């Protein structure tokens, strides 16, 4: 399948070169997979989600996304126009308040929730969790992410936006999950992207168009935007049967575009997520 005039990041993930604008992908499109977006919520009524999104858990007075961040990330995973995996099922877990903030204890509870809640959902092709959030190093936060991964969920986490080594941030620094840095449309490391040996992969993160609350759209930047590209890619590849939740991060690194990014510090992987789809 070909989506013309796609957001640059979608075109990038199906291309061996920057500077194109058509996204190419297998029509299976993540059907039969599920992606949990652990964030500020998801505006599931947005026409872009086509009935495939739902809130399953909140720790606050509403499950609604009063911020937009979670809706934007969910749109990059799986919206019809802005999403990588256009037929996946999206499940929202609201661990962040409408200012985008959340206590680590709530975030940990949300991760353990997903590890159990997947047993209440139909995801024959597999389960992914996208975590566009983080703070300072916490062994308890890292352990929660490790448990979620161990339970059979492909966990993708943002590297962080400090232009610093991600070893000092959580859950970015957890070795067993997929830690995602951000790149721009010219294949440069995004100016804010964290780096370091703990990164597994880069995805598009600068000037990413996606869904927003109020049935709208906007372009924003962050490792929060790169993470759902990788989460959606994992769901897409799992639906194709090419990999599993336990092996998807390694498979994405195996099959990435290699050596194409600029300003990658010595010791950080130079790997850009790529679907290897041959139309």
From Swiss-Prot:
A single BP term in Gene Ontology: proteolysis
Enzyme Commission code: 3.4.21.64
Active site residues per record: 39 (charge relay system), 69 (charge relay system), 224 (charge relay system)
Residue ranges of the TM segments: none
Catalytic activity: Hydrolysis of keratin, and of other proteins with subtilisin-like specificity. Hydrolyzes peptide amides
Disulfide bonds listed in the record: 34-123, 178-249
GO molecular function terms noted in the UniProt entry: metal ion binding; serine-type endopeptidase activity
Free-text cofactor note: Binds 2 calcium ions per subunit.
Taxonomy, superkingdom: Eukaryota
Sequence positions that bind Ca(2+) 2: 16, 260
Location of the Peptidase S8 domain: 7-279
GO cellular component: extracellular region
Cofactor: Ca(2+)
Function: Hydrolyzes keratin at aromatic and hydrophobic residues.
Protein name: Proteinase K
Species annotation: Parengyodontium album (Tritirachium album)
């Amino acid at each position: 399948a070909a989506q013309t005039n796609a957001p640059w990041g979608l075109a990038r993930i199906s291309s061996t070169s920057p500077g194109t604008s058509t996204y190419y992908y297998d029509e299976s499109a993540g059907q039969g997979s599920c992606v949990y977006v652990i964030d500020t919520g998801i505006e599931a009524s947005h026409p872009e989600f086509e009935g495939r999104a739902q809130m399953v858990k909140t720790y606050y007075y509403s499950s609604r996304d009063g911020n937009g961040h979670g809706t934007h990330c969910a749109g990059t995973v799986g919206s019809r126009t802005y999403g990588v995996a256009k037929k996946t099922q999206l499940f929202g877990v609201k661990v962040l308040d409408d200012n985008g903030s959340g206590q680590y204890s709530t975030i940990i509870a949300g991760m353990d929730f997903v590890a159990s809640d997947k047993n209440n959902r139909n995801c024959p092709k597999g389960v992914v969790a996208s975590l566009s959030l983080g703070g300072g190093y916490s062994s308890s936060v890292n352990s929660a992410a490790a448990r979620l991964q161990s339970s059979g969920v492909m966990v993708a986490v943002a590297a962080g936006n400090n232009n610093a080594d991600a070893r000092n941030y959580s859950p970015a620094s957890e070795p067993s999950v997929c830690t995602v840095g951000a790149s721009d449309r010219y294949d440069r490391r995004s100016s804010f992207s964290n780096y370091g040996s703990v990164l597994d992969i880069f995805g598009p993160g600068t000037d990413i168009l996606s869904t927003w609350i109020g049935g709208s759209t906007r372009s924003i930047s962050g490792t929060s935007m790169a993470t759902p590209h990788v989460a959606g890619l994992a769901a897409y590849l799992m639906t194709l049967g090419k990999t599993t939740a336990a092996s998807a991060c390694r498979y994405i690194a195996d099959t990435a575009n290699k050596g194409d990014l600029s300003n990658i510090p010595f010791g950080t992987v130079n790997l850009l997520a790529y679907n290897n789809y041959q139309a």
